[PDB]
Amino acid sequence: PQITLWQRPLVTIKIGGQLKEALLDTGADDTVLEEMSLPGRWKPKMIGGIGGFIKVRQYDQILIEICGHKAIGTVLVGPTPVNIIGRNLLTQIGCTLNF
Amino acid sequence: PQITLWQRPLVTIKIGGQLKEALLDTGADDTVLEEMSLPGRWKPKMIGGIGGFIKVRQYDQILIEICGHKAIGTVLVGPTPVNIIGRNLLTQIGCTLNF
Numbered sequence: 677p678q679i680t681l682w683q684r685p686l687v688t689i690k691i692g693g694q695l696k697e698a699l700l701d702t703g704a705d706d707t708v709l710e711e712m713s714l715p716g717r718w719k720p721k722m723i724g725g726i727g728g729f730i731k732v733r734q735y736d737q738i739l740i741e742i743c744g745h746k747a748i749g750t751v752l753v754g755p756t757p758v759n760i761i762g763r764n765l766l767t768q769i770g771c772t773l774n775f
Numbered sequence: 776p777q778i779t780l781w782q783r784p785l786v787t788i789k790i791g792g793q794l795k796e797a798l799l800d801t802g803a804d805d806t807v808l809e810e811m812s813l814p815g816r817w818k819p820k821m822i823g824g825i826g827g828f829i830k831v832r833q834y835d836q837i838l839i840e841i842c843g844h845k846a847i848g849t850v851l852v853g854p855t856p857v858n859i860i861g862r863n864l865l866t867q868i869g870c871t872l873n874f
């Protein structure tokens with residue numbers, strides 16, 4: 677798909693067997709989703725941005741399906757305002773920026 | 776050009792006669808630059824980030840060249856960790872996400 681940025685680039689993702697709405701975010705190094713439970717061992721992490729830092733739980737080797745393209749990677753879970761797909765998973769689906 | 780995401784999508788921008796580095800960020804609705812002096816009057820604006828809200832100053836019709844593309848638009852100045860080019864300017868340079 678070729679996605680215009682007149683609006684926020686929201687897409688559906690399937691994770692944990694759940695369907696969710698997420699933003700394709702090229703400015704984000706990591707993927708961060710709102711509170712949910714994933715199976716596995718997790719590690720605490722602090723991630724910061726505009727507004728300061730938030731504590732998240734880091735889960736590795738998670739499978740996600742973005743618009744139909746499976747991808748595997750680390751996923752951070754915490755009190756984020758919107759589900760964000762960052763560069764660690766966008767590279768796996770082959771997403772590029774073009775102008 | 777086509778930009779992949781294995782590295783942060785950093786580009787050089789020219790604003791006020793000077794060169795700065797900035798991040799092409801499809802997750803950011805607006806463009807926010809680190810503290811600097813711009814001409815004119817500014818208006819107040821509050822932006823929600825990952826760690827909360829920050830108050831920034833909004834300047835309108837500012838000329839900024841991004842990778843050789845001249846754009847004119849709204850730029851916010853505030854305590855951001857990095858210069859961020861958001862959708863309001865990414866649309867003026869014809870940027871899309873492709874996968």
Ligand SMILES: O=C1N(Cc2ccccc2)[C@H](COc2ccccc2)[C@H](O)[C@@H](O)[C@@H](COc2ccccc2)N1Cc1ccccc1
Pocket residue numbers: 701702703704705706707708723724725726727757758760762798800801802803804805806807822823824825826856857859861
């Ligand atoms: O705070 C952020 N994050 C922080 C972050 C860091 C790592 C992983 C995920 C997120 C970066 C931006 O900041 C940084 C900080 C450090 C390094 C790189 C980018 C995203 O890239 C932006 O897209 C947007 C992401 O989060 C949100 C929150 C609410 C609604 C929509 C998006 N903003 C806020 C923002 C909003 C508007 C203009 C400018 C910046």
